[PDB]
Scaffold this motif. Structure first.
Motif, PDB file in Angstrom:
ATOM      1  N   UNK A   1       0.833  -1.206   0.000  1.00 16.15           N
ATOM      2  CA  UNK A   1       0.000   0.000   0.000  1.00 16.15           C
ATOM      3  C   UNK A   1       0.863   1.249   0.000  1.00 16.15           C
TER       4      UNK A   1
ATOM      5  N   UNK B   1       4.921   5.160   1.463  1.00 18.44           N
ATOM      6  CA  UNK B   1       4.578   3.748   1.481  1.00 18.44           C
ATOM      7  C   UNK B   1       4.214   3.303   2.893  1.00 18.44           C
ATOM      8  N   UNK B   2       3.420   2.239   2.959  1.00 19.47           N
ATOM      9  CA  UNK B   2       2.872   1.721   4.207  1.00 19.47           C
ATOM     10  C   UNK B   2       2.178   2.798   5.049  1.00 19.47           C
ATOM     11  N   UNK B   3       1.190   3.498   4.491  1.00 22.47           N
ATOM     12  CA  UNK B   3       0.456   4.476   5.294  1.00 22.47           C
ATOM     13  C   UNK B   3      -0.499   3.785   6.253  1.00 22.47           C
ATOM     14  N   UNK B   4      -0.948   4.547   7.241  1.00 19.46           N
ATOM     15  CA  UNK B   4      -1.942   4.044   8.176  1.00 19.46           C
ATOM     16  C   UNK B   4      -3.188   3.620   7.401  1.00 19.46           C
ATOM     17  N   UNK B   5      -3.711   2.414   7.631  1.00 24.13           N
ATOM     18  CA  UNK B   5      -4.882   1.962   6.862  1.00 24.13           C
ATOM     19  C   UNK B   5      -6.127   2.798   7.093  1.00 24.13           C
ATOM     20  N   UNK B   6      -6.193   3.562   8.181  1.00 26.95           N
ATOM     21  CA  UNK B   6      -7.325   4.447   8.414  1.00 26.95           C
ATOM     22  C   UNK B   6      -7.288   5.700   7.551  1.00 26.95           C
TER      23      UNK B   6
ATOM     24  N   UNK C   1     -23.367  11.888  -8.195  1.00 24.67           N
ATOM     25  CA  UNK C   1     -22.698  10.797  -8.889  1.00 24.67           C
ATOM     26  C   UNK C   1     -22.193  11.249 -10.253  1.00 24.67           C
ATOM     27  N   UNK C   2     -20.919  10.972 -10.526  1.00 25.66           N
ATOM     28  CA  UNK C   2     -20.335  11.210 -11.828  1.00 25.66           C
ATOM     29  C   UNK C   2     -19.776  12.597 -12.055  1.00 25.66           C
TER      30      UNK C   2
ATOM     31  N   UNK D   1     -24.066   5.537 -12.114  1.00 22.14           N
ATOM     32  CA  UNK D   1     -24.881   6.722 -12.393  1.00 22.14           C
ATOM     33  C   UNK D   1     -26.368   6.448 -12.178  1.00 22.14           C
TER      34      UNK D   1
ATOM     35  N   UNK E   1     -18.607  10.976 -18.809  1.00 18.39           N
ATOM     36  CA  UNK E   1     -18.928  12.192 -19.565  1.00 18.39           C
ATOM     37  C   UNK E   1     -20.376  12.587 -19.551  1.00 18.39           C
TER      38      UNK E   1
ATOM     39  N   UNK F   1      10.421  -1.312   7.407  1.00 19.61           N
ATOM     40  CA  UNK F   1       9.071  -0.811   7.151  1.00 19.61           C
ATOM     41  C   UNK F   1       8.074  -1.953   7.002  1.00 19.61           C
TER      42      UNK F   1
ATOM     43  N   UNK G   1       4.837  -2.367   9.475  1.00 19.13           N
ATOM     44  CA  UNK G   1       3.484  -2.402   8.933  1.00 19.13           C
ATOM     45  C   UNK G   1       2.768  -3.687   9.327  1.00 19.13           C
TER      46      UNK G   1
ATOM     47  N   UNK H   1       1.704  -3.384  12.926  1.00 21.42           N
ATOM     48  CA  UNK H   1       0.563  -2.484  13.050  1.00 21.42           C
ATOM     49  C   UNK H   1      -0.727  -3.163  12.607  1.00 21.42           C
ATOM     50  N   UNK H   2      -0.679  -3.901  11.495  1.00 21.08           N
ATOM     51  CA  UNK H   2      -1.870  -4.606  11.026  1.00 21.08           C
ATOM     52  C   UNK H   2      -2.295  -5.695  12.003  1.00 21.08           C
TER      53      UNK H   2
ATOM     54  N   UNK I   1      -4.008  -3.989  14.838  1.00 19.95           N
ATOM     55  CA  UNK I   1      -5.331  -3.547  14.410  1.00 19.95           C
ATOM     56  C   UNK I   1      -6.318  -4.708  14.383  1.00 19.95           C
TER      57      UNK I   1
END
Ligand SMILES: [K+]
Ligand SMILES: [K+]
Ligand SMILES: [K+]
Ligand SMILES: [K+]
Ligand SMILES: [K+]
Ligand SMILES: [K+]
Ligand SMILES: [Mg+2]
Ligand SMILES: [Mg+2]
Ligand SMILES: [Mg+2]
Ligand SMILES: [Mg+2]
Ligand SMILES: [Mg+2]
Ligand SMILES: [Mg+2]
Ligand SMILES: [Mg+2]
Ligand SMILES: [Mg+2]
Ligand SMILES: [Mg+2]
Ligand SMILES: [Mg+2]
Ligand SMILES: [Mg+2]
Ligand SMILES: [Mg+2]
Ligand SMILES: [Mg+2]
Ligand SMILES: [Mg+2]
Lengths: 260, 146, 230, 186
Positions: free
Chosen positions: A136, A147-152, A201-202, B40, B68, C209, C213, C216-217, C220
């Motif tokens: 992620x 990279x590896x961000x907090x999943x929240x 939407x859209x 949509x 579109x 890293x 991770x 952390x998972x 969670x």
RNA sequence: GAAACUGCGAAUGGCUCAUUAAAUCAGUUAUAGUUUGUUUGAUGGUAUACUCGGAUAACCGUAGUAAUUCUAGAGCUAAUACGUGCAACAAACCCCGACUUCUGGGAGGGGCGCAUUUAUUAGAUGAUGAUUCAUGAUAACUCGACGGAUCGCACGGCCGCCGGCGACGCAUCAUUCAAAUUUCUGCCCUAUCAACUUUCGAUGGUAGGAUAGGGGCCUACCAUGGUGGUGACGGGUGACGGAGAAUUAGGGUUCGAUUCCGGAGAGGGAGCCUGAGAAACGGCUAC
């Protein structure tokens, strides 16, 4: 044309730069970088037109080639480096630090910040998705990949980035009731709390923002930047406090100042 | 029945010769007919989910995406293979005389076999990628004249 | 027809003018890279064997190898190739120039000839001297090959052998020595070591890293299970 | 040169469009590869937009083919081109194009089937796994009758003029029946 | 430090308005239909080494031609030029599988970097309004220009080994700079222009080819469509479009070659090479 444009005609420059009409045929074309060309403040402008340290193009070159200017903790020698919203501009010789924020008139203003407050920036999350190896990764609107961000953390979120360590130390979820600053459109530089999010939407999504004094304004999602959890922004604001004033109240202030 | 061409006609990325066939899996898996919701707020016609036709330009079972403009209109011609002419009627304001005049636009749209249409029906089309020289729209909903 | 004769062994060049029809015929109809016997084209040239390397016609147009005629043709040429130097011209630029065929004919102003086998006599100004090499080897392996060193032998000592010594116009002594290329120095070893350490740190950071991770998972998920335990 | 522009076409109303610009390079076309089935393999490097690479096969004799029901992929020789849906000229010229029907050598697939199932179309562990696989084993007897001749009907799914390779899948099921009917009607 | 090789640039800018009348262009969309040197951020593991090879310029000296950054031959010598080649090591995973006592264990062998191409499969009840999506796994595939034989400064710590700050370069993704194509609506006069388009693409369909990518863009086959008094098609324009300009109570009339944005052209056509980017013209080839 047969390729990229290298020149910016001065008339065609962004109007928030407040470049004068007769200063020359050309404006500094911002280099490619973290911020868009139409939404940035180039380093040469900051150094010469705003801070008055340099008086000419060549003097800006002389200042920058001395390695005196760091943008978000890193030395930049490109004069057209596209410094943008929330960027930290530090000069570790005079000991001054600047956060690029918007005033209520849509123009970038160099806001003085403390040494500790210059240790972080606020970034807006552009998207979260899987990279190579299934890892992620997060990307922002100021060009950073984390990279590896907090999943929240989801898209349109605001993350607090420590410039020294280059990690997300805290983040804000884009929710109703969070104080925000508008970074695009006619409400650029206005600060208020989100009251509701109207989704269609859209097409583009509309955010309804109400400032502290009670005025209500609406803007697209791409022009909203969360700056605090609740009614307390995480950064310091310029003197206007994001409260836009009508021209009548501006005239009232000018009359009061002249009378005093 | 649908194999009316000099080539076999298959939905892309659907393995028909699978050994572990199953019907409880998602569309396109285990040899199941692939179909999708266009989004949509448009419902997928049941004749597209239960169809046997193969249309790569179908919005619901093909590979095209709807993105579109969304344009309403009336079926003006339906004499082509899977393509119909959509006539749009609108009022053009004339500034000097402060009046309006009637103007029309003929928009070619691809129609998938999940709809049967006749000249005069009210159709809703959605913009897609260029499908031919003149076609950039796909029929999404057909309302008969009656 | 002039002959521009070069002796590659001694590095001497001399232009020879042959006008007699017979001697010229012993070169006619021949092609570039074809070799001639010196006894055919004169008395002083016995034993010598000459390689035809090219020439120019009466209008100064060079002969090109592989054209396979005696006349003049126009060819689309590439830069840096023979018959088209293309100095100051853009990269990828071709030009149609007039070139002459590889076959030697009577319409040639000069033949560029090379001596491949030394004759029994000696040619004045050609094989009676030896112009020395202007510069010596500059790459370390070439130096080792020249002086027949092996592993663990220092090449610098031998660079001092062929230093060029001369007097400045003021009168002071000046020595010129080439800078050795591809020479192993402690800085090169440090650079390789730093590259290896960069790979080390890349791998260590990746693993760090990934492990953080994963932890952390896991935390969670355990918190989610605590919620489920309600 | 070959162009891809809508300039030269008539309008949808039938009216002619007067040219307002010369041909741009960013809208070019190149001549077809016309990949032939031949044991003189030639793939040429085509430099394309962005400095990128396109592989242009001129002659090919070997391909990577997948047996989807068995989920096995083997490199096999191309023996013949038998059916094309766009032009039988490409059949007689033996032109390899995407969606062409070809004969491929069945030997690698026979070898894999023998190795994996123990069935031709030395340990307790090996025999146990072989019996487990042989339970439920079902071939379709059409693939079998073409295995008898050593030639499998296959469809070229790759584009040889673009990727330089002639890859595909072994025909099975309804597609196989369709193409057998086409070949018997030929 | 001249010169020269190598690298980069010369596709911007400047000029002009000839062509061009839903065409350019304007506002407004879209790429889930693509390319993108560079910047910014992140990423990079299974392929003599205390470091490989051959050339070549400058230089030098034999020239040719009336002549040109027209040109041939000889002698040298470099690399971040060119070409090779160890590529610091690893787990995991997949397949085959001697033996074992055995629904298993298991030596050993093979595969396995990244990229490419195809195929099978997972992606539930991570993402979008929406994707057989992101992405994972597996089987293979490719005669892969990938995975550092480069440079500067400082040079210390342990007993020869480690070692900082940089520069340049390769590849992937993201970002930025953009382009290409593309949705809707909108243009002057003329009917003494009412039918036009479709052999030889006209409108659509199928399968291909081609392209960076959608698409009659082209090919093969098939169907007979498509536009039109709501003016098609044609003709005229002393017609580049717009922002705008002049005059204006209001409404309006006329202009808009020209400095900002967009387009197009470099005597007229046409075709290309290089390059990330040109159908380039202070680049080439031809008429
Ligand atoms: K362009
Ligand atoms: K260039
Ligand atoms: K537009
Ligand atoms: K295409
Ligand atoms: K078609
Ligand atoms: K370039
Ligand atoms: Mg060196
Ligand atoms: Mg220009
Ligand atoms: Mg996928
Ligand atoms: Mg197609
Ligand atoms: Mg004109
Ligand atoms: Mg104008
Ligand atoms: Mg004019
Ligand atoms: Mg002028
Ligand atoms: Mg202009
Ligand atoms: Mg041009
Ligand atoms: Mg002229
Ligand atoms: Mg040209
Ligand atoms: Mg000129
Ligand atoms: Mg020019």
């Amino acid at each position: 044309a047969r390729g990229l444009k290298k020149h910016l005609k001065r008339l065609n420059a962004p109007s928030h730069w407040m470049l004068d009409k007769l200063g020359g045929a050309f404006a500094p074309k911002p280099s490619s970088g973290p911020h868009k060309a139409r939404e940035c403040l180039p380093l040469i402008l900051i150094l010469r037109n705003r801070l008055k340290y340099a008086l000419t193009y060549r003097e800006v070159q002389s200042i920058l080639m001395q390695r005196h200017i760091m943008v978000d903790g890193k030395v930049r020698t490109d004069k057209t480096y596209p410094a943008g919203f929330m960027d930290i501009i530090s000069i570790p010789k005079t000991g001054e630090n600047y956060r690029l924020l918007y005033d209520t008139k849509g123009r970038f203003r160099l806001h003085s910040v403390r040494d500790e407050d210059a240790k972080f920036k606020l970034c807006k999350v552009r998207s979260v998705q899987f990279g190579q190896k299934g890892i992620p990764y997060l990307n922002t609107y100021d060009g950073r990949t984390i990279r590896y961000p907090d999943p929240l953390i989801k898209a349109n979120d605001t993350i607090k980035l420590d410039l020294e360590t280059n990690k997300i130390v805290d983040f804000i979820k884009f929710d109703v009731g969070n104080v925000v600053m508008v970074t695009g459109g006619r409400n650029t530089g206005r600060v208020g709390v989100i009251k509701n999010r109207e989704k269609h939407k859209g097409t583009f999504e509309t955010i309804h923002v109400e400032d502290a004094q009670g005025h209500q304004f609406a803007t697209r999602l791409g022009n909203v930047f969360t700056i605090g959890k609740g009614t307390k922004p995480w950064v310091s604001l310029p003197k206007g406090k994001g409260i836009k004033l009508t021209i009548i109240e501006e005239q009232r202030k000018r009359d009061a100042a002249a009378q005093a | 029945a649908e194999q009316t061409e000099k080539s076999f006609l298959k939905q892309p990325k659907v393995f028909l010769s699978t050994k572990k066939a199953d019907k409880a899996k998602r569309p396109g898996k285990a040899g199941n007919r692939f179909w999708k919701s266009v989004g949509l707020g448009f419902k997928t016609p049941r004749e597209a989910i239960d169809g046997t036709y193969i249309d790569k330009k179908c919005p619901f079972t093909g590979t095209v995406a709807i993105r579109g403009r969304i344009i309403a209109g009336t079926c003006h011609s339906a004499k082509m293979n899977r393509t119909i002419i959509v006539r749009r009627n609108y009022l053009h304001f004339v500034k000097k005389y402060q009046r309006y005049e009637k103007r029309h636009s003929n928009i070619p749209a691809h129609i998938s076999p999940c709809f049967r249409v006749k000249e005069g029906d009210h159709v809703i089309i959605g913009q897609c990628r260029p499908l031919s020289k003149t076609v950039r729209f796909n029929v999404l909903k057909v309302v008969p004249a009656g | 027809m002039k002959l521009n004769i070069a002796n590659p062994t001694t590095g001497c060049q001399k232009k020879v003018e042959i006008d007699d029809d017979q001697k010229l015929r012993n070169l006619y109809d021949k092609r570039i890279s074809q070799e001639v016997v010196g006894d055919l084209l004169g008395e002083e040239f016995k034993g010598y064997i000459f390689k035809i390397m090219g020439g120019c016609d009466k209008q100064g147009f060079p002969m090109k190898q592989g054209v396979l005629t005696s006349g003049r043709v126009r060819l689309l040429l590439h830069r840096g190739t023979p018959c088209f130097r293309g100095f100051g011209r853009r990269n990828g630029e071709r030009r149609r120039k007039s070139v002459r065929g590889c076959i030697v004919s009577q319409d040639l102003s000069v033949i560029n000839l090379v001596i491949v086998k030394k004759g029994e006599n000696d040619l004045p100004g050609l094989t009676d001297t030896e112009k020395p090499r202007m510069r010596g080897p500059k790459r370390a392996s070439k130096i080792k090959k020249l002086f027949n060193l092996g592993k663990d032998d220092d090449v610098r000592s031998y660079v001092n052998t062929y230093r060029r010594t001369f007097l400045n116009k003021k009168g002071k002594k000046v020595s010129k020595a080439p800078k050795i290329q591809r020479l192993v120095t402690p800085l090169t070893l440090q650079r390789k070591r730093a590259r290896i350490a960069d790979k080390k740190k890349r791998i260590a950071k990746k693993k760090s890293e990934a492990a953080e991770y994963q932890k952390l998972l896991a935390q969670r998920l355990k918190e989610q299970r605590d919620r489920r335990s309600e | 040169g070959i162009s891809r522009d809508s300039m030269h076409k008539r309008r949808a109303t039938g009216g002619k469009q007067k040219a307002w610009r010369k041909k741009r390079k960013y809208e070019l076309g190149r001549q077809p590869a016309n990949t032939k089935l031949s044991s003189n393999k030639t793939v040429r490097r085509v430099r394309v937009r962005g400095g990128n690479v396109k592989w242009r096969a001129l002659r090919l004799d070997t391909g990577n083919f997948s047996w989807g029901s068995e989920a096995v992929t083997r490199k096999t020789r191309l023996l013949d081109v038998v059916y094309n849906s766009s032009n039988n000229e490409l059949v007689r010229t033996q032109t390899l194009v995407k969606n062409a029907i070809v004969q491929v050598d069945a030997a690698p697939f026979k070898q894999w089937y023998l190795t994996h199932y123990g069935v031709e179309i030395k340990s307790n562990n090996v025999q146990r796994k072989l019996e487990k696989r042989q339970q439920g084993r079902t071939l379709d007897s059409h693939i079998e009758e073409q295995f008898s001749g050593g030639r499998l009907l296959a469809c070229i799914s790759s584009r040889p003029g673009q990727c330089g390779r002639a890859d595909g899948y072994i025909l099975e099921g309804k597609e196989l029946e369709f193409y057998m009917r086409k070949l018997q009607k030929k």
